[PDB]
Amino acid sequence: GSMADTRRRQNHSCDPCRKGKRRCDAPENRNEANENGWVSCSNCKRWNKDCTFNWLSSQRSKNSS
């Protein structure tokens, strides 16, 4: 798990959904989505959770630090 492959990103769903096995609108560019008009996936806006890519931040490095 290094030369062949290191990172295994598949689900793009934000922290709360990916954990709860929910797929949301939140793309890989959820931040860039905020700039476009987006802000939080329907899940977060529905349950009032926390749209974050912390999962992304805990991968190869603190992507969002």
CB of 36 to Zn ion, least distance (A): 16
Give the range of 7-15, 31-39, 55-63 binding Zn ion by CB under 5 A. 7-15
Q: Is residue 1 a known part of a binding site?
A: no
Instruction: Supply 50's token pair.
Output: 């926390």
The two structure tokens encoding residue 24: 């949301």
Residue 40, classified by CB atoms within 10 Å of its CB into exposed (0-12), middle (13-18) or buried (19+), is buried
Contact status: 17 vs Zn ion (CB under 5 A): yes
Spatial CB neighbours of 54, under 8 Å, sequence gap ≥ 6:
15, 64
Tell which one of 1, 36, 44, 59 touches Zn ion (CB under 5 A).
44
Contact range with Zn ion by CB under 5 A, out of 1-9, 10-18, 31-39, 54-62 = 10-18
